[PDB]
Amino acid sequence: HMQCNVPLGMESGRIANEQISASSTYSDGRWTPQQSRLHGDDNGWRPNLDSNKEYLQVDLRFLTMLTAIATQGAISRETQNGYYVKSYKLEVSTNGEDWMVYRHGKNHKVFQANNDATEVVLNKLHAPLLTRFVRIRPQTWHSGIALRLELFGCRVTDAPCSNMLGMLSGLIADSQISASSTQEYLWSPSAARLVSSRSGWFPRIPQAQPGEEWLQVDLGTPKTVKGVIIQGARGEARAFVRKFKVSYSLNGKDWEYIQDPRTQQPKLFEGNMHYDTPDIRRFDPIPAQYVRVYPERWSPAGIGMRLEVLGCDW
């Protein structure tokens, strides 16, 4: 039904050469980043020096859900010595400037990796992530750092009626975006856009009583709304919303809240845990032209968010 263990294109070429890069490459030219394709038979990626600052980077080009990472090492075509990475960290970003290190509760997630130069090792993310750029960061290795790789996940838009409605793309125009208050005076509504914006929406006073501030999106016409993607903001400051309500409307005057079935009250959605890495919240489809997101709890810096609405036309 909703399959998200799909290989993203390292093995197949679905991820093109121009989307693969690295911190450095081995000085003899025989281990280019583009050799990091899973099951590739000509070595793999290997950096110039072996250190835990070195990394292999993949640009997915589009926001993608990431569920799993598969790695091998490599047997040198030249020496036939086997090289492999024994453990790594993961780093992700929507834009390639702003990075998050994957965590496991309190601290960094250390993925156990290969133990030979031939076998594939699969690590599932305990909690899946929405991202565009992926960085593998070896911490330990045998003989040297060598990688062949695959990434697994899916597009959010593969789910039925789950299109990005135009906050990111722009097809939802500046005039269609509004807010309770804005710190900027005569702000650019464009600032509230998921991913495509560098900053974000900040209300006037970073603190307020919960459910007093809102971002509102006019969809242009009545659509079917089936979810949101919420993201934090980079101001000076890095902020994100941790809890929010969602209200919706046809005529733009009479509002309704998405209700939690358990509590018979407006549902409290979980927000982000980072200023860049966004989160998808799906719900049962509603008819709406207007959607309001109401921050309820937030980071200590204040309310800061970027947003996208998910759905399709009637």
Side-chain angles (χ1 to χ4, degrees):
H1 175 44
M2 213 148 283
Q3 281 290 288
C4 210
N5 65 338
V6 186
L8 304 170
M10 293 299 294
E11 177 156 12
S12 68
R14 193 87 171 64
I15 293 167
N17 292 335
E18 294 71 33
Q19 301 167 241
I20 306 168
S21 59
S23 45
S24 74
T25 192
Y26 199 69
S27 63
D28 79 350
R30 298 290 295 106
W31 308 66
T32 64
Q34 297 74 21
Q35 277 156 276
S36 76
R37 300 185 182 278
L38 205 83
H39 306 291
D41 58 12
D42 190 352
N43 302 337
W45 168 72
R46 176 185 186 192
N48 171 44
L49 318 149
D50 296 320
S51 90
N52 60 34
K53 301 186 187 309
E54 299 287 337
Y55 63 88
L56 176 78
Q57 174 186 302
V58 179
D59 185 0
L60 305 168
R61 292 285 146 92
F62 306 96
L63 275 66
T64 309
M65 188 70 59
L66 169 74
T67 55
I69 304 169
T71 62
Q72 312 161 285
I75 307 169
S76 163
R77 183 167 294 195
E78 291 69 47
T79 70
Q80 313 190 357
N81 295 348
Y83 302 86
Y84 50 96
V85 169
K86 284 155 70 116
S87 72
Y88 57 87
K89 290 169 173 185
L90 171 67
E91 258 197 57
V92 293
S93 175
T94 67
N95 55 38
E97 300 182 319
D98 294 323
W99 295 94
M100 190 189 74
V101 181
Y102 195 70
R103 320 219 169 213
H104 199 195
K106 303 262 305 182
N107 45 53
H108 294 185
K109 174 54 179 186
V110 184
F111 288 101
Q112 302 308 308
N114 300 94
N115 293 91
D116 52 43
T118 61
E119 306 313 305
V120 178
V121 166
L122 185 65
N123 291 301
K124 306 287 299 303
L125 278 49
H126 65 270
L129 291 168
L130 213 54
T131 201
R132 179 187 155 178
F133 297 87
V134 170
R135 259 172 193 183
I136 309 301
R137 288 219 186 233
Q139 306 301 301
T140 60
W141 51 85
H142 182 87
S143 286
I145 294 157
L147 279 184
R148 284 169 301 156
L149 181 74
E150 182 69 270
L151 309 169
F152 301 88
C154 63
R155 307 180 149 276
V156 280
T157 69
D158 292 332
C161 192
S162 181
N163 298 304
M164 292 190 61
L165 291 177
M167 287 292 282
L168 186 153
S169 73
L171 308 169
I172 294 171
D174 284 337
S175 69
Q176 296 169 248
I177 306 169
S178 54
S180 64
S181 65
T182 179
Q183 208 152 3
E184 293 177 350
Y185 176 77
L186 295 174
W187 58 294
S188 178
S190 206
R193 294 176 183 275
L194 173 80
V195 176
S196 75
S197 167
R198 268 296 136 83
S199 47
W201 168 61
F202 298 84
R204 261 269 269 178
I205 307 166
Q207 63 161 214
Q209 71 190 60
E212 198 199 333
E213 310 291 331
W214 38 274
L215 188 75
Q216 168 172 316
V217 177
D218 181 5
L219 298 173
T221 50
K223 310 258 190 186
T224 300
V225 175
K226 209 161 162 160
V228 298
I229 305 167
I230 187 173
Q231 177 183 33
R234 203 182 80 250
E236 289 296 321
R238 306 161 161 197
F240 53 84
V241 166
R242 284 197 275 255
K243 274 199 198 315
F244 63 93
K245 292 174 183 189
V246 166
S247 76
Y248 62 94
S249 178
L250 275 182
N251 63 17
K253 294 199 185 197
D254 308 327
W255 296 87
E256 288 197 299
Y257 288 92
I258 291 168
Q259 301 285 331
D260 194 308
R262 303 285 230 112
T263 60
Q264 303 190 308
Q265 287 307 298
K267 197 209 162 53
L268 297 167
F269 295 90
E270 297 292 327
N272 302 113
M273 286 160 282
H274 193 252
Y275 77 96
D276 177 78
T277 297
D279 293 82
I280 179 173
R281 305 298 169 213
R282 295 183 183 288
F283 36 80
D284 297 334
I286 38 160
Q289 193 173 322
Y290 307 84
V291 182
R292 274 175 169 161
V293 168
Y294 285 86
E296 192 78 9
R297 276 89 176 94
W298 44 88
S299 65
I303 299 165
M305 75 157 64
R306 281 163 286 176
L307 184 72
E308 178 62 277
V309 182
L310 300 171
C312 64
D313 206 50
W314 276 16

